[PDB]
Ligand binder design. Structure first.
Ligand code: V5L
Length: 153
């Protein structure tokens, strides 16, 4: 679809020239729908000094379906499982999710960045990590810092 291609061209230009702070997103080779991204570990978060790589697949029906995004770098977090799947509203269509064509790759990457800083323990993919975050936050922070040191630095 030509509407999809023109939209992806504009997004790649905006991601190259006005990337959100801490965020980088690029075409892996020669396909505008096979992308990668990088989110820097946030300051005053256990991920600080970590560098986290993600895969960003643009589906056929984009912008009417959300980008398909998974972490390639392991991360220790209530809402991200050990295969890097992400539980986040803007990555799912209504009624459960909040994706709409007014959002874009940069918006949802920023949403992931914020999720890293502020987990949603009510919708976990890792129940035990989530309980740890809710009830033993110092142990969570230490385990998140250790996971970051082993896998993201
Ligand atoms: C609160 O709205 C939600 C939207 C999406 C999820 N998902 C989590 N993992 N896949 N989808 C959970 C809650």
């Amino acid at each position: 679809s030509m509407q999809r291609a023109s939209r992806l061209k504009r997004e790649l230009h905006m991601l190259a020239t006005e990337p959100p702070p801490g965020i980088t997103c690029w075409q892996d080779k020669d396909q505008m729908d096979d992308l990668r991204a990088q989110i820097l570990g946030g300051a005053n978060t256990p991920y600080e000094k970590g560098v986290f790589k993600l895969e960003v697949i643009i589906p056929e029906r984009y912008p009417f379906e959300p980008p398909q995004i998974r972490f390639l770098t392991p991360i220790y977090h209530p809402n991200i499982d050990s295969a890097g799947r992400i539980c986040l509203d803007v990555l799912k269509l209504p009624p459960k999710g909040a994706w709409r064509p007014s959002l874009n790759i940069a918006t949802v990457l920023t949403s992931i960045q914020l999720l890293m800083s502020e987990p949603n323990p009510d919708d976990p993919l890792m129940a035990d990590i989530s309980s740890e975050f809710k009830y033993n936050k110092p142990a969570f922070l230490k385990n998140a810092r250790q996971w970051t040191e082993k896998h993201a630095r």
